[PDB]
Design a binder for these strands. Structure first.
Lengths: 168, 168, 168
RNA sequence: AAAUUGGUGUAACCUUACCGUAGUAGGUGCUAAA
RNA sequence: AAAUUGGUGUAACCUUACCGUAGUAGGUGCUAAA
RNA sequence: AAAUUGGUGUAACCUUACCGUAGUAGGUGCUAAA
């Protein structure tokens, strides 16, 4: 019921972006892009929603969740349009206490993000279900479904790729 | 479920005040007195509750609803004691956007009044039912019913007048 | 459902402290220590929870309720650890209006305490039940039950004393 | 990283929220009358 | 337009709310003790 | 009057709240990034 952050291996990310160019760059050079775990599986897949720090972009509310700290500063945006299915061997859980020891500023940011998300996980969940449903409909897309398909990863294609990974 | 404002024809108002002198003067010279529509019919009649701008009078809470704007200024009082039954041909719906085009200050006041009322319509409804019941009881009036009868229009008499109008 | 304050006769208090030294000193010299009545009887006994003005002590939350006024000043602490069973002849109801006439400052303090408590009586009740249960368990006490037994009056012993009083 | 349609309020603007069983919250403006 | 009783809080005052299965919210005052 | 353990938050500090089906509220600090 309470969100867990994760980093995803750049190997698996690059492997996914082969099938869909909208998968987020991992930029693992200093802080590998954290993802939030969707609370329940979707069609047997563990899904993960990427965070971005590009807080001032034009986001449509249907595919994003803006995070705010107690003083109302923008502290990240969850991109539900770029959520991805990931196998449990290609993701690592983030220990905020650990991250705070290695990098005090960043770990504390992550704590703020955690405190915001545990109050707002209903909304993430809600949006995740609405867009997944609409992106995966067939066949003739409404006006909205066309927009969603354009701005979102090809979820079904990525699920196949996840399946293909399960040759291990 | 959301309130609609109306103006009432001065012909019908004058016709009602023949039967009961407590019917409100319409003062149609610049802004004909707006009324709020009671959400549900009463004994088959559409009832309408008059607004007044006399915000500082001594009102008893049982027969009034004070409206306030976001900065807490007084912006009207609904006189449930002066509510009246009106046939649908003798009342016109108020288009706030239209009124705002013709008279920016007044139309905007009316918007504020609308925004307040849509949050407070339960209370209007509640008070409308309590006073209508008490005014129309028989036979021997309690202390309260005597007060209410004195300060309120003779609802049953006005309903008869409404019926008589239905010769059309 | 709404709390009543009481004073308890110093005779009965001294009689109780014979059996358990943790019973609160009554200090009846100017303002006899007020107690709040537990809303429901416990095993047939009327219980009363003492107030203290020692607002800055180290209290454990499990056995106390801190009272605050509207400006957030500390205005007493209910000691659920020192609650006692009292027969109805050894306690007097406090008339706050009366106390306010005799001693304006103190009576008004008591009003503030009343206004706080009527909003917080669920918590008093809640804590009263938890500690009474744990203090009166047997036989082998948990870590917590040992702490509670040490800091609380011997409720069962005081109940016997209450029974013994009923020779009247 | 990039890409974020169109809609929902008797709602003028910004931020926030909502998504078709769709308008929440904070500002700004207006400061009006029967 | 005019006319708005009396009541509800262990509640002193103002505004607000409530209406007999009746006291909410914001101020002011008090700033007390076991 | 005295006496107030130990615990509960992906929670650094103070106050407040909670009590094992256990972390609410207000401050302080941090002001970080993909």
């Amino acid at each position: 019921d309470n969100p867990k952050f994760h980093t995803i291996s750049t190997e698996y990310i690059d492997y996914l972006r082969e099938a869909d160019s909208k998968v987020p760059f991992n930029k693992d050079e200093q802080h590998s892009r954290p993802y939030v775990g969707v609370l329940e599986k979707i069609n047997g897949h563990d899904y993960f929603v990427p965070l971005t720090s590009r807080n001032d972009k034009n986001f449509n509310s249907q595919v994003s969740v803006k995070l705010f700290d107690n003083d109302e500063k923008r502290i990240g945006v969850l991109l539900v349009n770029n959520m991805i299915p990931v196998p449990e061997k290609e993701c690592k859980e983030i220990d905020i206490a650990e991250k705070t020891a290695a990098d005090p500023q960043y770990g504390n940011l992550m704590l703020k993000q955690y405190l915001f998300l545990k109050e707002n996980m209903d909304r993430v969940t809600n949006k995740v279900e609405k867009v997944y449903k609409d992106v995966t409909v067939q066949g003739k897309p409404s006006h909205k479904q066309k927009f969603l398909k354009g701005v979102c990863c090809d979820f079904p294609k990525l699920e196949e790729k996840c399946q293909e990974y399960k040759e291990r």
